[PDB]
Design a protein around this ligand. Sequence first.
Ligand SMILES: [Zn+2]
Lengths: 224, 51, 59, 108, 142, 50, 86
Amino acid sequence: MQHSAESWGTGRAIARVPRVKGGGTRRAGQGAFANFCRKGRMAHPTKTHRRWARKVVENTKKIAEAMAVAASAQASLVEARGHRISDVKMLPIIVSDDIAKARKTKDAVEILRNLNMTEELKRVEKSRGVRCGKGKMRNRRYTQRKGILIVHGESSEMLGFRNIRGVDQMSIDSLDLLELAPGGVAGRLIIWTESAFEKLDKIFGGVEREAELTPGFKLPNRIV
Amino acid sequence: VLGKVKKIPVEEPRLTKEQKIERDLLIKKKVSKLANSIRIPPAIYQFRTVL
Amino acid sequence: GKITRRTREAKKKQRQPIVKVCLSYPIIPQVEEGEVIDIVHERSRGAPVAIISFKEDDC
Amino acid sequence: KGNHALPNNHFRKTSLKIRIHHDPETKARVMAEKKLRKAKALFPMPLKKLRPIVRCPTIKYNRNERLGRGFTAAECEKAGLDYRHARRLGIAVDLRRRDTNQEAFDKN
Amino acid sequence: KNLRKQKTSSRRKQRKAHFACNDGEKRIRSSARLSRELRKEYGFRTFPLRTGDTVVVKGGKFDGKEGVISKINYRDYKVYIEGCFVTKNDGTNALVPIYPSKLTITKFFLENGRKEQLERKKRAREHGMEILRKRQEEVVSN
Amino acid sequence: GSRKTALVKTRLMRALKRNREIPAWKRMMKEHKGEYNRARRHWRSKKLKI
Amino acid sequence: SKGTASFGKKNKRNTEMCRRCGRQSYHKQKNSCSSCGYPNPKMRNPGSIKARRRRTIGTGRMRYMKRELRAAKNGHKGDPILRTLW
RNA sequence: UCUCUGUUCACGGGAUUGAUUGGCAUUAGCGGCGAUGAAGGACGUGCAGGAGGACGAUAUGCGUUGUUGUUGUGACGGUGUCUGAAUUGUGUGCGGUGUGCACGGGGACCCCUUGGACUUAAGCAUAUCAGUAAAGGGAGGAGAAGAAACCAAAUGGGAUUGCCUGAGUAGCGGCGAGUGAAAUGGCAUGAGCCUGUGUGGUAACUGCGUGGCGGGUUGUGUUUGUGGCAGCAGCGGCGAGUGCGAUUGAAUUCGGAUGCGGAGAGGGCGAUGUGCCUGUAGGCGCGGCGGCUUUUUUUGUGAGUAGUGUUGCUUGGUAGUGCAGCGCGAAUGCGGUGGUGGAUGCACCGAAGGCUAAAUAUGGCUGAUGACCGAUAGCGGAUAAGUAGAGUGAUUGAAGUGUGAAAAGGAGGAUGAUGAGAAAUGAAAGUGAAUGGAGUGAAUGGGGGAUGUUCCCGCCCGUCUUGAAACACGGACCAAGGAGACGACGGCAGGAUUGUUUUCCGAGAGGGGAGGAUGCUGCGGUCGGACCCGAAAGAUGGUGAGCUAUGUGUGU
RNA sequence: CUGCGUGAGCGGGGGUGGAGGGGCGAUAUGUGCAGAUCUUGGUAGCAGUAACAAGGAAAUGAUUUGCGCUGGACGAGG
RNA sequence: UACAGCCAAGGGAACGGGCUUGGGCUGAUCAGCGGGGAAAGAAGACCCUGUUGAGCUUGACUCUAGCAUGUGUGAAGUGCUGGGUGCCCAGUGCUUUGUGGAUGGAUGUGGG
Ligand SMILES: [Zn+2]
């Protein structure tokens, strides 16, 4: 729209669109402003105040986190979405809180082979590669599958688990839905510590008893 | 601006340190003669009597 | 409308005037004696003008 | 056309303006770092002042209490203190308020 | 206007810093690695290149050759080595350019004040390997 | 014309010693081949405007 | 004869090069530049939206203002000799 | 041979696929010019130089310091022709002839002045658009505001500024179209001071100077930080860990091994990457620049103002909500205010002098990000783009990216060489050469059959219209681009979570029990540029008497 | 060139090309062209047509001869 | 420049190159020519409609610059003639010691 274009009107044997003023250049006399003209503007330009986010009901947010936690103990659901497990003892998996003393990465990898999580970290490594279409040049060049999630109850992070390709961490006081059910499908493979696993009855309560650390919430009752 | 003639400012000439002094005493005389030709109130006229 | 001829002829004359010379004689209470030194024609007048010379003044 | 409520949407002025902050999560935590930085520049003294308990005005809010602006000079005097000296000890003083109730005067 | 320690991880900003940096930074990005037998005297890995150094090629059609650097072009990332050439359609020879990160340094050059550059960096590394040892051994108690 | 001001003369001189092709030693280089000046003016087609 | 034949009479030039801005727009009978307004002490208000971005801060060399900006990042220390007097 | 139609090879053109040191958006900091000569302009500077970029007679760059041996470069300091506010000037303070200050640039956001019309009302004049755009004057990193001559009607709150609720409500309005607050309640941030009546046993005071001059009694009254405390940015340097086999022009591919990790962010390298290089995580060293921080005893006042008659403008303010011209013009146990003009009780406050952080706004610059665009897109501008070019002037304004891993090499033809490959890919419209078939019928299509035809059927599409093959309009051909998406407020349908839901009638005076709430997708309604393209006009601010018209000076 | 589908469309084979490309579920849209005297670029027929030029000669042409009428200076503009 | 290009009648949006039923020159050239293609050019200027304009007029509606005429503001001191009931005002001459530059409101006029 950076011109002083005006239409020529009828009577000259050319169509009525507005046209550039001037002389001495091939731009002079060509179409301007219209959505069907070369170098024009869009019919309905894109604007910054469209709605980007959405609102979820607060209670439905917590029903979804409880389904995702419940599905991490059915072995049929954890094997449907990948997650090769043929040598774990029983689900759910719980270890003591003294894995936080592994502060070198060489030890944290030894704790994970003792739990038979060895062929799982190999499946994530071999799935890494370049993305197919145009997104690869928009700073999104590599993709790969999801692996193990460590739900602990200590402070900021475990430094010795941070470099392993295929391992995430989460705090019991956060418990977000975007890590628990990746892609919107429940059944991730989770490893609990013993301090975090004991706080699960205060966060979610029961079907007819309210929960403390979350005022009001009760599990929904059954329809069959 | 429609066939007319211009605005013509003035900024009249300036006095130079002896026309100014000559212009201050002209005003002091013209104002003193008016102060003695109108009726003077009593509270200001009493100061015309000194030791 | 547009502005009439009478009003524009008045504005043209403040821009570019016709000028005449303003004849007049001075003040001399004592009987002096003058001297006509010239009689001359002038543009825009019909009457001739005389140049008269006194002891300390011309008119 | 049709049976609808009569609409009253005011968008007839070209001078109107829209205003949106598109990232309020980073804006909140940038203001909590400002708030913790004042606190340890005043270090020993706690950055907030002690305020009184007052009563909401009309008959609709009559039965409700609230934190107010400051204490009065008589409330400070009877607690053994001068209001010029209560201000150096982190107490807020309001010389506009008037004293008209004896129970509320005692709570403060 | 140095740019090789950018915080950003954007692809357009990183390729811009490789192809358009100043000549001071073109020399550090043209760095080569030392051999095993030369890395026991000095403690460090890679060091930058200059003419007169003896190197060895690794990969390509000149894989396994050894020679002396006769010219470098830092601005274009091109190294010319005596003994890797080709015959034009006239009977004449020409030297072929090689990329600096496919070479290995053996027996470098020590004459134009370069004997001291190697000794300044050998001291900075052993002074830094003790700040790490004292911190580590005390954080051993940590 | 033969008559001209001093400021008109020094700008006509500057415009004159600009209308020139790339020197031959620069075109013979390896990385300057196929380059021509392309900012050239001919006195009949384009006018300088004083 | 108001077309082709009237063009052969146009050999007088009304303007010259302006000594403030350098365009061929200083009108000699008017004593005034139609681009920048010289000899008024202030520069003329531009006649269009695009005219503002053809001649402003940054479209020339900025010989002094660049130097001053490098000095204000270091606290305006001056010549190291004269620093004893200050 | 010519016309139409198959097939193969060669042209012509630049679509498509894949790239990208460019664009665009949101967010965090900063907001740093000038008489100590700015921004902008003109002309110059290299041994061999035109454009661009860089630079100023110390000119294609000089000094100090770091890194280097190189076409060398980083960080800081110096120089800067002739111009331009451009000033050897004009105005003005302090002095008494000395010495200061103002002027211009920019102006998104802020303060003050002035002030439209298009448009809506299906016409139009009050009204609306709108005290908005344009114009002018004055400031800063923000500005302006600010410590009750307040709000109210309780058992009362308690400076300014921003956000939610109150509420499209009370009200204003050819009571039409339209227009439109605030208090309370809930949050963010929080902070209060200076003066015009200061001694009389002696101006106790200060600008200039080194125990003096100037000011001042018509009234001056101004110590102190190389110390501490908290913070913010920058610069420099060190930085772990590798080798064989197969395919390839070359491997990061495929197959055995062997290590690092507070480092498996991203980028380059002859191709798809944890140990090939750069960095990365994390420690060390060194400048710099700010914010807080020193408290001798003091008492009392704000007039050509407030108000008011009249006239003009403004506000939701309705019989001033606020402001201004002209004229009149106050009080001292007194003055002001309480959503209808006036009276009188009760309530609540002290105007007409001065200063004040924080929470708020926003072109551009610098950092960090992205369900954004990918060369007719994205900024006009991925290149010597506000350039080439156009106009008397104010102004106006494009088109153009790709040899290869390596120059290993070509450029009239032919013969050849190098390379993995003659070298980005290379559609349609249209054409040349060869070769097969058909024709003297406008061509093309469907059924049924067949290596062209023979029988039957078949007028040119789109559109407005009672009605088109029309002597109704648009359409020579091909590629690419090209039009109901988005915001606010309400209703209904389908779906999700939860359910111990509801301030009623009436102009008032008076009277008085009767399943929703919060999101998500779609459709209908209104205002927004509003599905896309199109007037004749109206207003604000600027340019021209080189063509042509008239007057006047001086020539032919 | 060939298979499947009532259709919108989806597969396979041989050349060319020399680096990346997909299926399935939910989600975000600048989401599908024959037309607008549509926009920008390229190309036909018309058509080797209209229009324009071919100035007097002498094997040679610094020599011989035939024809036309502006010719020479100052200013503006270049 | 939709595609094309020989005629008669019929019906048809009531004057067909194409549709129905009949009549036909001539295989591909060159120069001419002005019957037809309701030939080309130009979103009919005539005429009507639109709650679309603009130039101009006045006895259209609503206003307005300027101009006229009372009246408020402005400078002090004095004499004189006249009105009504002591009173307010008119003209009014004089003196020098303000000044003449203006400015608020009211009624009439006003196709400039
Ligand atoms: Zn100028």
